[PDB]
Structure formats: structure tokens, C-alpha cells
Design a protein around this nucleic acid. Sequence first.
RNA 1: UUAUUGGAGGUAGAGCACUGUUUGGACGAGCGAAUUCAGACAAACUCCGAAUGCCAAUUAAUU
RNA 2: AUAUGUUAAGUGGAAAAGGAUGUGGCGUACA
RNA 3: CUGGGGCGGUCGCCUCCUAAAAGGUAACGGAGGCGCUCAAAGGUUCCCUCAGAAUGGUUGGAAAUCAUUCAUAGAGUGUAA
RNA 4: CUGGUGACUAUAGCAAGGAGGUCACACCUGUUCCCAUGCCGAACACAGAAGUUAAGCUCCUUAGCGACGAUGGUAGUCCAACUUACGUUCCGCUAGAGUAGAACGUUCCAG
Lengths: 78, 93, 110, 56, 136
Amino acid sequence: SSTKNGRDSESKRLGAKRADGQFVTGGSILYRQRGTKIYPGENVGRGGDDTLFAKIDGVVKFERKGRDKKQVSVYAVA
Amino acid sequence: ASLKSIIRQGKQTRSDLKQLRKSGKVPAVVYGYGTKNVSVKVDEVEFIKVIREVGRNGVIELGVGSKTIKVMVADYQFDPLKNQITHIDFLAI
Amino acid sequence: KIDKNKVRLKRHARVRTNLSGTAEKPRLNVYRSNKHIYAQIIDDNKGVTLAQASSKTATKVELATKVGEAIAKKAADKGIKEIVFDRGGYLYHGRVKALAEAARESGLEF
Amino acid sequence: AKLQITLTRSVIGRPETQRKTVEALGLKKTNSSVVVEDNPAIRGQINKVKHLVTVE
Amino acid sequence: MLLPKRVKYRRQHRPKTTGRSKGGNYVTFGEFGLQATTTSWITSRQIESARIAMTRYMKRGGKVWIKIFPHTPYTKKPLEVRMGAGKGAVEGWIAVVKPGRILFEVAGVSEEVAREALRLASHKLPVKTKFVKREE
RNA sequence: UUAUUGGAGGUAGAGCACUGUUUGGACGAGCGAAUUCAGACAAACUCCGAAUGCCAAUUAAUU
RNA sequence: AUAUGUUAAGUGGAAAAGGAUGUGGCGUACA
RNA sequence: CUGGGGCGGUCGCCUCCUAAAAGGUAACGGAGGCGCUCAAAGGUUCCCUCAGAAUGGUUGGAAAUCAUUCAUAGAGUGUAA
RNA sequence: CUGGUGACUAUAGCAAGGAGGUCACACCUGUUCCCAUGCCGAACACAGAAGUUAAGCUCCUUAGCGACGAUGGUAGUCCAACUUACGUUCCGCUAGAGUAGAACGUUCCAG
């Protein structure tokens, strides 16, 4: 006459943080994830916990990298 | 006697297809070699019996726009609950 | 019953993931064979090849040095000093370093 | 100056998203009208609330 | 007594039951079949009762097939208990049937002995049925 | 708010290529589920995959 | 009110599995 | 805290499903784990590649060891997912 | 109709059969010379008269297994009317099918 379940952990706010074609700064977080579901591109770095961040100012670009794989890059605005 | 035919022009709405089936006429598409992709209209009963003679892989000889084209049945759609054919695909070799 | 160079390309691919050549730092590629040795300067960021030099004795080691200053002088004419060396997937020893040594000592900044 | 739209049905009992499209066109109360020229974005608003207004 | 030998989870959710059948709408093994026209749950005990009657009438005349299987279990609570305090316990296994699916297929008999063995077996089921032949 | 051009995200449906569960045959390695020919099932299965909604573009018109 | 059709049960104005040459519509020598 | 209160069970943190393809979201709803460990199981440079192995053998209740081909990763990755 | 080095979702693959060279790639005969194996100068690098297209490697052919796949229907679905399961209007699967397809190709070395 009792329950053995009832536990759960706090939810992490994973996913993308900026949109394609948007302007960002040098240290803007772009994608929080577990592992590498999206790979870094041009002018992008992968953090310790797999967080993707930019390194310069420019537009964001989500593109495809091979068959069944995605990346994110940043290009300076001219 | 070769069977008759009608050409469906444009794009029909969900209602137009349902009313066409209610009348007793089933839509069809012909995409075989030597022909283009044209939507046609053939009587359900007229097809049910002409297919009896030629069988499964016999030659239909359907006529589209005053031009008879020898054709065959490739695949069709059937409703088991209401027992009513829905779609027919004609393949011309 | 294997291909020696087929596997070598896979090792070269792993090396060229973090090693790239730009305009200011063009990559220096080195291709090897059973008899002759080669070299090449590439600008991948756009896709242009700048220089080219090849042998065509002593295990072809002295010939490897024959290409060291041969290509270095080509580059020296255009006055480009900074470069990035590319092994090619061949162990850095013997003839490979000869081509690099023969070019590094000729006023070329690696 | 090509179209005339008049509000026939009220906005009581309608989703808040539809009540906002009736404000962009310039309709205040029931039976109120307004005149505008046929634009590509103008017909995108009428189509969303075509069950409430009467375009003429 | 059809029941899966093992399952990963013993407490599942109940199926939707609303809509039309997904697959298995034709006869592919025998000469005749029994098609359903309504929705309902079918238990292992119902499948047992409905196939023993069919076997007796045919007198071991031919082959009989069962195209449904009770994959999903259902739980039940004790008697005179209040709401909450956990979920119940397994009671039985059921299968979902919707209009347009075949339940039984027989072969090796005529069209008359087959239309009477399926009528005596359609009264044990809680769903409406119909006689269907291999579509030409 | 709307039209348009872009992106991120696997639900409905569908499917059996993975993990399971599971009906009827064929072939002798001890032959109904780590071989093959057919037919099905799944909140914690997915080779596939919408309609909507969401984030953007000091882009256009109405407010 | 007008036009064309259906139902005889007070159906309309409460419900199922099943049981009935009740009565319409559209398709495929019998005493 | 509690489908009245007692009695029983539960109280912080981590992962998954319910959750309705952004994020967020309840129940005494459905399943597990944690209160560490490693001086190399860390950094760097160069190399390498796994299960299962339709058969051969110093022939030991077909699977320790060795040999050649099938091998879309069915192996591993200190410890749950 | 070559070698080197990059760009692109196998339409670039897997198979099966065929043709070709000592100018180039390879195979290839050696371990004194730098360096290398937890048996194998096996691999790694080496010192390099000959020996050969049997395979590695190529340009040519074939749609068998994989891969790419519209048109037309169907399921599902936003909105709106009926009412609970049925109408109307936009979007638009999966699967299957007619089908593409035995790569396209920048710079570059010498022919």
C-alpha cells in the first residue's frame, strides 16, 4: 500500500539560444547540449560541457555538415 | 467496343472527389511509357467488367482526348469496408 | 595483400583537421613515393596553389634536400617567410625532415 | 480605396489571437466599416477572420 | 491462454481506440475471413471461447488462423479501496480491434461450412463482424 | 497582426532498418524468435515524418 | 407560405447485443 | 505532506517516460541511481582499432590460447540512465 | 586521355566480369649504415644492377544488391459550421510505383 516511485531531477534549459540570421556578440551562447549533436563551424568554439559559443560579431548560420549531421557558423557582417 | 473516358481538368477539392465517387465514377492516373501524366475519369462498373475479359494483365486500350492508347492496370486502391474502388493507375508499355 | 598509400591518406586526413593553410601561413605539403619526392604550397581558404617543386642518391635523402632549398628559393623570390609544415601522414624522420631541414635553414620561418 | 470591410459579428467569445487581427484592420465596434486598398498583406488578415467580417 | 512469455513493463497506458484500423485488412492465409465493423477490446478468454466453437463445427476439416494477439495488459484495483496510493496490478491481456480488420481465417472447407463456423464464433465476441472472401 | 524568405525542435500518422514481443510455412548447424519467404504489435522502439506553434531578418502594408 | 419526397409509429417527444417476405431508393415452368 | 485523521510510506541531488517535434509544466503517476573514485583512470606527442570469429589445430563435457576470410560498429567508454 | 591537392548528402558505393605499361605509381632483391618489433626487416625506414602486369591502380562496358525518386490517390491536420462523427475550406505523410543513376569536377606538374 505504498509507492516506490516519485523522484525526478530539475529540468535543464537545453536547445538553441539564438536564431539563424541574427546578429550576436563575441561571447554569445548559441546552443546548449549534452555531447555533440551540432558541431561548431567557422568562428565557433565548443565549451567544456559541450556548449557552443561564438568568438566574433556577425550573423548566425545553421547549415548541414555531411549526411545526417549539422553545424553552426558565424560570418562577419560587411 | 473500347470504353469511354473523361479528362479531369485543374485540381479538384476534397468535396469534388467525394461527389465523383458518389456518382459512380472512379479517378485514374496514366504514367506509362509513351504518354504524359493525365488525370482521367472512367465508370466504375464499365471498368469492373472490361477487366473481367482481359483479366489482371490484359490490354485496356483506354482512349484519352480522342487518342486511344493501349494500356494496362498497374495498381489500384480498394475500400474493404464499403467495397468501393478508389483509385486506378494505368501503365502503358 | 594490402595497399600502403591507401591507409596513409587516412592518417593524413586526421593530421589536416587542425592544421590548415591560409594566405599569410600557406601550408607546405610533402608527397612521397618509392623513388622521387615532391612538395607543394596551397591556399585552401580560396583554393589556389602558389609554388611547386619536385626531384623530377643516398636513399634519395640528398635529393630530398635538393628540393628543400629549391622550393624555398621559389618562395623567397615572392618574399613569403611564414608557412605551416605538413607531414602528409609520413613519420617525421629521414627524408621528410630533409625536405623541411633543407628549406627551414634557407631563411624560412616555420 | 479598393476594398470595404464591415464587422458583422461581435468579438465576445473569440480567441484573443483573432481579437488582435480585428484591431490591425481598424474595426472598433459591430457594424463598423473601413476602406483600404487590396494588398497582399491585407487579404492575409481578412482570410484569418473571414468568418466575422464581410468584404465587399 | 494466449499471453506474452515476458514483457519489459507490466503497467502500460491504454490504447487510443479511436480511429480506423492500421493494418491487416486482407485475407492472405485461408479462403474466407471474419471482418470487424466496430471497435472493442478482445481478451484472451474471448479468443479461446470463439475458436473452440469454430473447431467443433468443422470437425477438424481444415486449417484455422488467428491474426490477433493480446500484447497489452491492463491493471485493476482491489475491492473497496480509496483513490490513489499507487497503480493497480495486472489482471489480463487485451487486443485492440477497429473497423476493417480480420480476426479469423479458415481454409480447406466449402463456402457453406465456412459461413456457419464463423457465425457460431461471432456470437462469442463483443464486436460486430462480417463475412469476407479473398478479394478478386 | 498579416504576406514573404530563413532556421531550431521528432508529436499525429506511418514503418519493422535497431532493441523487444509475436502467427503460418520452407530449408538439416544443435530446424515456430542473431540463417530465409509471408502477415502483425509498442508512453519509456525509429530507416522515415506532417499540420500547427516558436525564434529571427531597425524587410513590406494595416494598426 | 410555396416546390418535391419519406414515415403510421404519437416514431417525432429516452437506451444495447440480437430477432423479423414493415415499407422506399440505387446496383448484380413458379401454383 | 496526506482523496478526513491515525497507522504505513515519503522529505536534498542526478537521468529517462508521462510532456501534446522551441523552452517550461501536476498527482501517495510509471522505472533506476548518488552522499564516490583515479597519482594516472590527468596533460602532451606519435601510433592503433573492436564484438561476433559458416572452418583448420599438442582433439582437454563446441567459448581460454594460435591461424585465414563474412564483419554498417551488433565492442568498448571507472560507476544509474 | 596521368600524377599531386581541395569542393561538394553514395546519382560519388558494393559487385561481376574484361583491356593496358618498364617514361610514372606498385610489386620487388637486401639489413653493414640513422631509426623500428612485447614472435615475423611482418609493418615502420630504409640501401637499391634485375625480375613482372598475377593482384593495388586506371580509363571502357552491364541496373543484379544498396542509393536518388516526381504525378495521382490515401492517412493526419490549422480554421469554420453541425454534433459527436458528420459536412466545408487551406496545408500535406509514410509506404508503393513510372523513374534518374556505373559521378560531377577548381588549382595544378609534366605529357
